[PDB]
Each structure stands twice: as structure tokens, then as C-alpha cells.
Amino acid sequence: ILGGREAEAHARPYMASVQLNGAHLCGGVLVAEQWVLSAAHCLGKVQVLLGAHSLSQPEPSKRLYDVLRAVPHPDSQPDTIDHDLLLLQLSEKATLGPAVRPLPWQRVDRDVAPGTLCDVAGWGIVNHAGRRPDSLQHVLLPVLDRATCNRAITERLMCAESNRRDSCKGDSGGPLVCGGVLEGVVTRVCGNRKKPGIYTRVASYAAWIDSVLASA
Ligand SMILES: NCc1cccc(Nc2n[nH]c3ncnc(Nc4cccc(O)c4)c23)c1
């Protein structure tokens, strides 16, 4: 996250670090006891760290989970920006507590009103030099209407302003949360107002997400 602040420890209990060979790779969001939503482009040994604030310091809620299954969206492809969702099934149901709690997601397929303030969090890089934070960062960003944002922004995507405050490398797959509801997933440039952050609209994929979770 560029232009943000250290988050209050465990105030976003849905927040997940998707890890590759023991290191933070991507953000993710806990959406059921056994399921984490992230970005297909993120995907070697894949695990998910729940209940974390700091990557390095002991916390009673920190737990690392193995991934039984990785389910990219059928239409996802390495070339395109479209359909960039990934569902990760954990090795077991996560232990829920004050610091680990699924986030409900939007299933009514309608845009977030432009100008709405949404919260984006992650352990992605905090400056253009690639400095990686130890602790979770966040920032509030206003939604940008699709017309202004537009060529490439389809009805399955949405934009948020990137004027100094922005998501960046390592924040991919993390949640865009508007009024306590998951609305987007972070999917490029950072901190440049001319290139808004692009986010996948979870409501466009409601049927696919239900269908995968319903295979329990
Ligand atoms: N702001 C939208 C957004 C969302 C998610 C990820 C991203 N960026 C990136 N995703 N992957 C990346 N691999 C390498 N570099 C990247 N950006 C970068 C790195 C150093 C300096 C700088 O100004 C920008 C990114 C950007």
C-alpha cells in the first residue's frame, strides 16, 4: 500500500497473506471458514496466513494453513486482466476468533456508487523502492466511475483513485471493502492518478463463488 498507515492490529480479521515458499506473495480475503479469495495472477509451496498483523512478531491469533485446492476462474488467462479471481481451499476450517473472521461479500450485481470510500489493505510494498512492511497497511480510496476510468475497464471490473494513495505490488488479491462488505479484489502502475487501481467486482462472480463454496 502506497500512501497509507499501519492498520489497527486485527481490526480486519478477514485479511489473509497468501504465501509462497514461506514469504508473503499476495493478499487474500477469508470468505468462508475454509476458503480464501485472491487473484489468479498470483499463482511451488502455497500457504495462507490468517490472524496476522505483523509477519515477524508472535501473535496469539497467527496461524498458517496449507492449501488443499487452488481454483482459478475458468476464463482466467495469464495475458488478460479479466476474470482474475482465485479461490483457495484451506487444509481445515479456520479457527475463528476476534482476529479471524470471514468477510461477507456483495452478491447484488450493481456498481458501487462513484465517490464511495472503500478500504484496501495489504502487506504490499510501501514505496517505489519496493520496501516491504512487516505489518499490515491500509488506505481509504474513493471509487472512480467506470466511464472516467475508461478502453479496458469492463462491467466486471471497477476502479479506485490512485492519486498518491494506492494499492501496489504484493497487495494483489487483497480486499476492497466498502461499508464492511467485500466489493472488489485487487488485480501495473502505483501512485499515479492517471492510472486508477483496477479491482475485480466480486458481485459479477457471485454465482461462480457460490458454486465453488457449495462443493464442500
Ligand atoms: N495500483 C494498482 C496496482 C495493484 C496491484 C499491484 C500493482 N503493481 C504491481 N503488480 N505487480 C507488480 N510487479 C512489479 N512492480 C509493480 N509495481 C511497482 C513496483 C515498483 C515501483 C512502482 O512504482 C510500481 C507491480 C498495482
From Swiss-Prot:
Effect of R188G: Abolished ability to cleave CFB
MF GO annotations: serine-type endopeptidase activity; serine-type peptidase activity
Biological process according to GO: complement activation; complement activation, alternative pathway; protein maturation; proteolysis; response to bacterium
Domain (Peptidase S1) ranges: 1-214
Main location: secreted
Post-translational modification: CFD is activated by the removal of 5 residues at the N-terminus, named activation peptide, by the MASP-3 isoform of MASP1.
InterPro entries: Peptidase_S1_PA, Peptidase_S1_PA_chymotrypsin, Peptidase_S1A, Trypsin_dom, TRYPSIN_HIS, TRYPSIN_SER
UniProt-annotated catalytic positions: H41 (charge relay system), D84 (charge relay system), S172 (charge relay system)
Coiled coil region boundaries: none
Catalytic activity: Selective cleavage of Arg-|-Lys bond in complement factor B when in complex with complement subcomponent C3b or with cobra venom factor
EC number(s) from the headed UniProt entry: 3.4.21.46
Homology family: Belongs to the peptidase S1 family.
Domain statement: The self-inhibition loop inihibits the serine protease activity in absence of factor B (CFB) substrate.
Name of protein: Complement factor D
Protein source organism: Homo sapiens (Human)
